[PDB]
Amino acid sequence: GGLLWKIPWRMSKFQKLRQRRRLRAVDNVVATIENALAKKGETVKAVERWRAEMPTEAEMLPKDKYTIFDRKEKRYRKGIHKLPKWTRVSQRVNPPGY
Template structure:
């Protein structure tokens, strides 16, 4: 008569969709652009004073800008445990706070 439902019987039920929604993608692009803008602002401010830092120079050489990134690199991340070695970036804890611009080549 009283059968427990699956969420009640199985503990905490995580309902994370398998792909990002279009507003989530727009916010991700906006975050990437804001980071690029901050790095540009810091670089301009340092160059006006005649200084430069290794961190800013390294950012420019290693990290692609938002416009240069492929869609799969913007919205997915490499994961060796996944079937096709990729999973949605929103399944990574704290994905809004980490820079996930670099992924292994070929995946």
Template sequence: MFKPTSPLLGGLLWKIPWRLSRPQKARQRKRLRAVDRVVDTVSAALQRNGGLTTKAVERWYTEMPREEEMVPKDKYTIFDKKEKKYRKGIHKLPKWTRVSQRLNPPGF
């Protein structure tokens, strides 16, 4: 009577492509550059206000690479110890547009 379909067999069927599309990659680069601009703006405003600085801004500059310095592998994928090659597409991460994923373990 009823044919078993994927939603009936396993619940909700997630249709997430295995790689990012060109527009998704462009938007990801745009988001990374926007964050860089915000940090630069905050740093410049603090410098104008009597040469002030904060630990958070200094830490960002020392630890986080800028969008131009990042390898494409780090821009579009994240480290995941459960994956076969220890990498998965950044779009598979929940709320991937709001979380900064600039740092990954070296060598993976």
């Protein structure tokens, strides 16, 4: 190609700090909504699905926070900053073994 989209393949230590803090901020929203309902003895299907199949920032591996699964990459991994609107989208789980 000729149109230059200068996107580095890896993130900087400053972007990683904000990715860590963005994952840790979505945990407080799900922990606030999950505890607010438990006091009322209530539950939601989407709040129970999240806690089941999604990990917290303290349970994620570094490669799951800064990378995603791309079948067209050599090692099936791609920088998470390559995902559209990656800053306002949730992406924590990748296919097993990849």
